[PDB]
XYZ file of C-alpha atoms in Angstrom:
481
model
C 0.051 -0.032 -0.099
C -0.824 2.194 -1.616
C -0.717 0.388 -4.925
C -0.384 2.464 -8.027
C -0.471 0.611 -11.367
C -0.707 2.094 -14.849
C -2.288 1.437 -18.311
C -0.054 2.947 -20.746
C -0.619 2.191 -24.470
C 0.449 3.953 -27.593
C -2.558 5.173 -29.502
C -2.309 2.867 -32.780
C -5.194 0.865 -34.100
C -8.211 -0.721 -32.412
C -7.542 -1.965 -28.900
C -6.585 -5.713 -28.997
C -7.675 -8.304 -26.501
C -4.064 -8.902 -25.412
C -3.742 -5.223 -24.438
C -7.183 -5.134 -22.959
C -6.361 -7.989 -20.576
C -3.309 -5.895 -19.410
C -5.719 -3.205 -18.828
C -8.128 -5.491 -16.964
C -5.402 -7.257 -14.859
C -4.133 -3.768 -13.679
C -7.721 -2.636 -12.975
C -8.532 -5.637 -10.977
C -5.194 -5.609 -9.045
C -5.649 -1.813 -8.249
C -9.279 -2.435 -7.119
C -8.248 -5.644 -5.274
C -5.661 -3.878 -3.192
C -7.446 -0.524 -2.603
C -4.963 0.923 -5.140
C -4.994 3.513 -7.895
C -5.366 2.705 -11.624
C -3.467 5.231 -13.799
C -4.271 5.818 -17.395
C -1.506 7.388 -19.273
C -1.256 8.004 -23.047
C 2.005 7.209 -24.620
C 1.755 9.568 -27.527
C 5.267 10.970 -28.023
C 5.411 9.184 -31.319
C 2.105 10.368 -32.982
C 0.846 8.485 -36.049
C -2.094 9.414 -38.341
C -4.549 7.174 -36.736
C -3.687 8.433 -33.321
C -6.880 10.248 -32.395
C -8.884 7.389 -34.154
C -7.017 5.053 -31.653
C -7.213 7.238 -28.680
C -10.884 7.538 -29.035
C -10.982 3.690 -29.587
C -9.076 2.833 -26.404
C -11.285 4.954 -24.108
C -14.412 3.422 -25.649
C -13.072 -0.101 -24.977
C -12.354 0.666 -21.456
C -15.609 2.534 -20.922
C -17.789 -0.201 -22.549
C -16.042 -2.913 -20.546
C -16.796 -0.963 -17.300
C -13.154 -0.140 -16.495
C -12.771 3.508 -14.982
C -9.473 5.060 -14.421
C -8.593 7.017 -11.238
C -6.023 9.320 -12.946
C -5.402 10.063 -16.549
C -7.453 11.760 -19.507
C -10.613 13.804 -18.587
C -10.268 13.020 -14.842
C -6.737 14.505 -14.227
C -4.641 13.637 -11.204
C -2.094 14.950 -8.808
C 0.709 13.524 -11.079
C -0.155 15.010 -14.531
C -0.373 15.991 -17.351
C -1.245 12.311 -18.428
C -0.327 12.609 -22.034
C 3.324 11.980 -22.632
C 3.136 14.556 -25.518
C 2.469 17.268 -22.895
C 5.594 16.499 -20.747
C 8.426 17.405 -23.107
C 9.573 19.801 -20.470
C 9.840 17.160 -17.693
C 12.054 14.870 -19.811
C 14.497 17.518 -20.747
C 14.826 18.510 -17.063
C 15.260 14.964 -15.992
C 17.788 14.453 -18.819
C 19.481 17.501 -17.579
C 19.855 16.232 -14.080
C 21.043 12.669 -14.989
C 23.645 14.432 -17.035
C 24.865 16.751 -14.302
C 24.946 13.937 -11.813
C 27.154 11.924 -14.156
C 24.401 9.188 -14.255
C 24.341 9.782 -18.049
C 26.552 10.960 -20.625
C 26.598 12.374 -24.315
C 27.740 9.708 -26.820
C 29.085 10.425 -30.251
C 29.894 7.024 -31.633
C 28.788 5.981 -34.989
C 27.955 2.161 -35.424
C 30.749 1.983 -37.805
C 33.090 3.346 -35.029
C 31.765 0.915 -32.506
C 32.025 -1.980 -35.048
C 35.715 -1.087 -35.772
C 36.467 -1.130 -32.072
C 34.904 -4.616 -31.783
C 36.950 -5.613 -34.797
C 40.120 -4.232 -33.363
C 39.389 -6.100 -30.038
C 38.833 -9.378 -31.654
C 35.249 -9.282 -30.441
C 32.105 -9.760 -32.514
C 30.668 -6.458 -33.771
C 27.098 -8.040 -33.113
C 27.670 -6.936 -29.515
C 25.857 -3.640 -28.808
C 27.370 -0.335 -27.787
C 30.660 -0.805 -26.075
C 30.795 2.081 -23.463
C 33.582 3.753 -25.105
C 31.993 7.299 -25.072
C 32.299 7.066 -21.104
C 35.811 8.289 -21.061
C 35.689 11.102 -23.628
C 37.670 14.209 -22.715
C 35.950 17.627 -22.638
C 38.315 18.524 -25.564
C 36.960 15.284 -27.499
C 33.387 16.281 -26.839
C 33.637 19.953 -27.798
C 35.482 18.809 -31.012
C 32.602 16.439 -32.040
C 30.043 19.228 -31.483
C 32.163 21.469 -33.610
C 32.078 18.799 -36.308
C 28.305 18.837 -36.263
C 27.867 15.488 -34.531
C 24.621 15.126 -32.804
C 24.994 13.154 -29.663
C 22.623 10.986 -27.960
C 22.241 10.649 -24.301
C 23.100 7.221 -22.761
C 22.637 5.857 -19.149
C 25.677 4.664 -17.243
C 24.772 1.000 -16.255
C 25.961 -0.337 -13.044
C 28.642 -3.091 -13.422
C 27.054 -5.799 -11.250
C 24.356 -8.516 -11.948
C 21.055 -7.176 -13.247
C 18.222 -8.833 -11.469
C 14.638 -8.582 -10.158
C 11.949 -10.896 -8.557
C 9.117 -10.918 -11.191
C 5.818 -11.262 -9.506
C 4.638 -13.807 -12.256
C 7.980 -15.008 -13.515
C 10.024 -15.154 -10.219
C 13.775 -14.267 -10.235
C 15.209 -13.147 -13.599
C 19.019 -12.346 -13.777
C 20.994 -10.769 -16.453
C 24.819 -11.319 -16.353
C 27.067 -8.405 -14.955
C 28.229 -6.311 -17.765
C 26.100 -7.979 -20.398
C 23.585 -5.048 -20.936
C 25.372 -1.909 -22.607
C 24.792 1.621 -21.613
C 21.569 2.536 -23.353
C 20.370 5.432 -25.390
C 17.862 7.763 -23.666
C 17.506 10.012 -26.563
C 17.695 10.168 -30.467
C 20.243 12.362 -32.373
C 17.462 14.915 -32.555
C 17.478 15.200 -28.688
C 13.994 13.782 -28.243
C 13.552 11.118 -25.331
C 13.009 7.497 -26.121
C 10.566 4.998 -24.423
C 13.744 3.996 -22.538
C 13.576 7.420 -20.874
C 9.837 8.435 -20.917
C 8.552 5.068 -19.470
C 10.514 4.774 -16.201
C 10.745 8.634 -15.926
C 6.803 8.699 -15.849
C 6.518 5.523 -13.787
C 8.874 7.135 -11.281
C 7.108 10.651 -11.353
C 3.558 9.059 -11.016
C 4.812 6.970 -8.354
C 3.981 3.512 -9.799
C 4.537 0.788 -7.300
C 3.854 -2.129 -9.585
C 4.383 -2.662 -13.282
C 2.258 -5.288 -14.984
C 2.873 -5.714 -18.625
C 3.135 -8.205 -21.519
C 6.273 -10.298 -21.345
C 7.340 -9.124 -24.795
C 8.722 -6.155 -22.931
C 10.619 -8.292 -20.264
C 14.122 -7.590 -21.868
C 13.654 -3.795 -21.198
C 13.393 -4.382 -17.588
C 17.102 -4.370 -16.473
C 17.548 -0.967 -18.350
C 14.438 0.550 -16.482
C 15.481 -0.864 -13.101
C 18.952 0.649 -13.839
C 17.255 4.056 -14.696
C 14.964 3.817 -11.860
C 18.117 3.330 -9.523
C 19.658 6.515 -11.050
C 16.365 8.438 -10.543
C 16.369 7.681 -6.632
C 20.132 8.959 -6.628
C 19.170 12.185 -8.339
C 16.053 12.603 -6.183
C 13.341 12.088 -8.773
C 12.021 8.967 -6.921
C 12.618 6.993 -3.768
C 11.079 3.500 -4.647
C 11.697 1.025 -7.341
C 8.555 -0.742 -8.680
C 8.024 -4.285 -8.778
C 7.520 -5.770 -12.312
C 5.001 -8.236 -13.334
C 5.168 -9.803 -16.731
C 1.936 -11.207 -17.906
C 1.828 -14.293 -20.212
C 1.471 -13.595 -24.134
C -1.849 -14.648 -25.605
C -1.533 -17.376 -28.312
C -3.358 -17.364 -31.635
C -4.352 -20.706 -33.441
C -0.685 -21.846 -34.231
C 1.783 -21.648 -31.274
C 2.677 -18.121 -32.458
C 1.373 -14.970 -30.846
C -2.396 -13.991 -31.729
C -2.133 -11.693 -34.631
C -3.587 -8.348 -35.138
C -4.692 -9.376 -38.603
C -6.473 -12.418 -36.939
C -10.161 -11.227 -36.303
C -10.379 -12.904 -32.755
C -7.699 -10.392 -31.261
C -9.927 -7.452 -32.137
C -12.088 -6.240 -29.004
C -14.768 -4.637 -31.222
C -15.325 -7.762 -33.491
C -16.368 -9.525 -30.290
C -18.591 -6.479 -29.308
C -19.939 -6.253 -32.925
C -21.008 -9.921 -32.778
C -22.947 -9.228 -29.508
C -20.402 -10.024 -26.745
C -21.731 -8.436 -23.544
C -19.067 -6.695 -21.350
C -19.651 -9.391 -18.604
C -18.913 -12.291 -20.852
C -15.804 -10.708 -22.397
C -14.509 -9.550 -18.891
C -14.983 -12.972 -17.580
C -13.136 -14.439 -20.638
C -10.158 -12.029 -20.706
C -9.687 -12.726 -16.856
C -8.866 -16.410 -17.753
C -6.089 -15.401 -19.982
C -3.483 -16.286 -17.451
C -5.440 -16.723 -14.304
C -8.071 -18.853 -12.675
C -10.241 -17.495 -9.796
C -10.730 -21.082 -8.218
C -9.967 -24.760 -9.012
C -13.735 -25.655 -9.010
C -15.136 -22.839 -11.432
C -14.309 -20.282 -14.028
C -17.639 -18.398 -14.027
C -17.577 -15.154 -12.324
C -18.661 -11.594 -12.356
C -16.364 -8.592 -12.032
C -16.992 -7.999 -8.225
C -15.960 -11.512 -7.487
C -12.829 -10.941 -9.790
C -11.875 -7.953 -7.773
C -12.052 -9.600 -4.295
C -9.969 -12.528 -5.768
C -7.352 -11.061 -8.068
C -3.815 -10.750 -7.156
C -1.255 -10.780 -9.939
C 1.106 -13.067 -8.104
C -0.977 -15.969 -8.937
C -0.891 -15.305 -12.681
C 0.821 -18.168 -14.386
C 3.846 -17.735 -16.612
C 2.343 -20.396 -18.924
C 1.045 -18.930 -22.274
C -2.598 -18.780 -22.542
C -4.316 -19.775 -25.754
C -7.422 -17.903 -27.029
C -10.479 -20.221 -27.210
C -13.442 -18.681 -29.003
C -15.609 -21.735 -27.899
C -14.697 -21.084 -24.446
C -15.353 -17.211 -24.841
C -18.808 -17.799 -26.604
C -19.672 -20.389 -23.787
C -18.909 -17.819 -21.086
C -20.868 -15.099 -22.880
C -24.040 -17.388 -23.241
C -23.939 -17.922 -19.413
C -23.635 -14.298 -18.778
C -26.432 -13.624 -21.151
C -28.527 -16.323 -19.361
C -27.575 -14.657 -16.046
C -29.064 -11.152 -16.856
C -32.483 -10.297 -15.525
C -34.977 -10.243 -18.442
C -35.609 -6.436 -18.414
C -31.825 -5.673 -18.791
C -31.264 -8.380 -21.445
C -34.404 -7.295 -23.479
C -33.215 -3.567 -23.628
C -29.775 -4.846 -24.656
C -30.979 -7.157 -27.277
C -33.351 -4.490 -28.701
C -30.457 -1.968 -28.860
C -27.969 -4.269 -30.403
C -30.349 -5.252 -33.221
C -31.564 -1.544 -33.868
C -28.064 -0.007 -33.790
C -27.275 -2.644 -36.358
C -30.089 -1.639 -38.763
C -31.852 -4.895 -37.675
C -35.045 -3.482 -35.769
C -37.508 -6.381 -35.188
C -41.121 -4.976 -35.956
C -42.702 -6.238 -32.686
C -44.198 -3.798 -30.072
C -42.644 -3.329 -26.691
C -44.630 -6.283 -25.156
C -44.412 -8.651 -28.194
C -40.650 -8.063 -28.376
C -40.105 -8.578 -24.612
C -41.764 -12.152 -25.161
C -39.564 -12.817 -28.098
C -36.451 -11.630 -26.099
C -37.359 -13.951 -23.202
C -37.366 -16.842 -25.644
C -33.969 -15.782 -27.243
C -32.119 -15.378 -23.819
C -31.368 -19.046 -23.490
C -31.000 -19.852 -27.406
C -28.078 -17.432 -28.248
C -24.399 -17.386 -27.642
C -24.066 -13.671 -28.750
C -26.629 -10.796 -29.242
C -26.330 -10.768 -32.888
C -27.689 -14.371 -32.996
C -31.032 -12.973 -32.694
C -31.268 -11.302 -36.081
C -31.502 -14.580 -37.733
C -33.893 -16.186 -35.280
C -36.256 -13.287 -35.153
C -36.288 -11.544 -38.759
C -39.461 -13.598 -39.784
C -41.329 -11.168 -37.577
C -40.564 -8.549 -40.175
C -42.809 -8.727 -43.234
C -39.854 -7.237 -45.257
C -37.364 -9.910 -44.121
C -39.845 -12.991 -44.740
C -38.276 -15.452 -47.362
C -39.038 -19.038 -47.776
C -35.804 -20.678 -47.886
C -35.533 -22.949 -51.091
C -34.535 -26.208 -49.306
C -37.220 -25.848 -46.556
C -40.109 -25.328 -49.199
C -38.709 -28.288 -51.321
C -38.538 -30.661 -48.196
C -41.617 -29.528 -46.240
C -44.044 -27.852 -48.798
C -44.581 -30.623 -51.246
C -47.176 -33.402 -51.681
C -47.971 -34.498 -48.151
C -47.369 -30.802 -47.077
C -50.948 -30.297 -48.702
C -52.940 -32.360 -46.169
C -50.858 -30.903 -43.385
C -51.358 -27.213 -44.261
C -54.994 -27.909 -45.171
C -55.614 -29.561 -41.822
C -53.755 -26.785 -39.879
C -55.660 -24.159 -41.544
C -58.683 -25.819 -40.663
C -57.776 -26.359 -37.064
C -56.530 -22.722 -36.547
C -59.445 -20.920 -38.034
C -61.586 -21.837 -34.851
C -58.981 -20.888 -32.304
C -61.000 -18.461 -30.090
C -58.271 -16.682 -28.157
C -55.074 -16.671 -30.423
C -52.678 -18.013 -27.695
C -49.748 -20.665 -27.777
C -51.622 -23.146 -25.595
C -54.738 -23.038 -27.877
C -52.697 -23.007 -30.939
C -50.813 -25.908 -29.808
C -54.204 -27.730 -28.731
C -55.720 -27.221 -32.152
C -52.673 -28.167 -34.111
C -51.984 -31.288 -32.119
C -55.681 -32.566 -32.570
C -55.603 -31.923 -36.250
C -52.165 -33.162 -37.265
C -51.044 -35.811 -34.672
C -54.426 -37.175 -33.473
C -56.219 -36.447 -36.854
C -53.544 -37.194 -39.481
C -51.631 -39.382 -37.103
C -48.056 -38.253 -37.906
C -45.131 -37.655 -35.704
C -45.211 -34.329 -34.195
C -41.959 -33.368 -35.855
C -43.373 -34.134 -39.224
C -46.844 -32.518 -38.293
C -45.191 -29.216 -37.253
C -42.480 -28.914 -39.708
C -44.185 -27.604 -42.666
C -46.190 -25.281 -40.508
C -42.821 -23.968 -39.257
C -41.792 -23.062 -42.814
C -45.037 -21.638 -43.656
C -44.808 -19.230 -40.796
C -41.073 -18.423 -40.430
C -39.636 -19.364 -43.827
C -37.090 -21.926 -42.381
C -36.869 -25.120 -40.916
C -35.211 -24.021 -37.479
C -37.066 -21.261 -35.448
C -37.990 -20.078 -32.007
C -40.476 -22.310 -30.240
C -43.290 -22.503 -32.894
C -46.400 -22.018 -30.984
C -45.162 -18.898 -29.146
C -44.018 -17.688 -32.566
C -47.406 -18.167 -34.069
C -48.902 -16.127 -31.064
C -46.567 -13.127 -31.613
C -47.089 -13.162 -35.250
C -50.881 -12.626 -34.970
C -53.638 -14.702 -36.188
C -53.936 -12.673 -39.355
C -50.349 -13.073 -40.475
C -50.160 -16.766 -39.414
C -53.325 -17.556 -41.482
C -52.167 -15.491 -44.326
C -48.587 -17.051 -44.299
C -50.015 -20.628 -44.005
C -52.615 -20.089 -46.986
C -50.014 -18.834 -49.398
C -47.703 -21.542 -48.373
C -49.817 -24.473 -49.822
C -48.902 -23.755 -53.438
């Protein structure tokens, strides 16, 4: 205590599920511990789609129910929260590192390092060789008079580089194996190698939780974090927590070009935020050994990032859909109906039932869909303008024996006093099973097609009710021929 974690993407492209898990895992850990969840935009390197992506990231976080405590809109005591608005801070902090002799200006060309390696017998493949450490003030001034644009490098300590990862356990880099690293470009502008730990340090981050594709960076940042305390910019080093990389369909990383990495594809299909949050949570974590179905409140009580496994998680759409279905099934019918109706509408797929008739239809669909979008195909027969008898269904059901069936059905239905599913059922059973003596599945099949256009449909008798006497009869009579 008090825990401060951070979600700090670059604004490029739609938020991917791997990145959103990181978001989720920090939000849960903050919320678990009584801590603070900091939202920092890493937009020093602005690309064209950057506002498109910024807007996309906040929408992801706001759809899924993940507020931030400090960041965009809300502010905080440690701002600004856009890296692009902190250029002054980096330059100052670079000034102090330099003055302290924690960092130094380097002038070496890669050809010059290469030749030194060559001269040494060493392989050039090795990185920077720390040469520029010992430059004379004469050598420095000379370079500047030549027009050489130095970059700023951090002086690494000379001992073993290690930390105890919260997920991976102890990780060690050999002493002297990681070269003094660039903090700026030739232009003078700070790199991620400076801005990331500088901001973590200054925003007082206590725990870093991030994809393990960043792991290598960590001994540089610990080295930087250590200088920052010496210079008085910080007083603590954060703990690191490297989260398992999410796998695709081959044992490679889940691709950005692969549709299932895209958060909004899931949303577009009709994932509800509850289903996707439960899923994403299981990407490197279990809540218990006896179950994997939980809401967000149960997640927050239970989540500690030390139980995250270093074993790679594979994305399982079947598992995802399965969780979404149970979450759909878990909503109270009022909430679900308003979610179903809005999904459909805002997709141009408005079902032409009134508020009460739709409510009935939605109650039938709650247990028959894996996603919200599944409804369109099940329900669109309620729309006169979407009605189409499917070629296969009319060929199989609406032939020779279809005639007596539709004839008998039409006969039975015309005397149904109150048009209600029980009485429709009671009439249709008496005329078709009892009367014509066929198996229910063969008695009701062509009736299904006449009313719905297809061979798979919501409960048939409820469907006939919602459709009204008039349209049922109308559809059945036209179906004969």
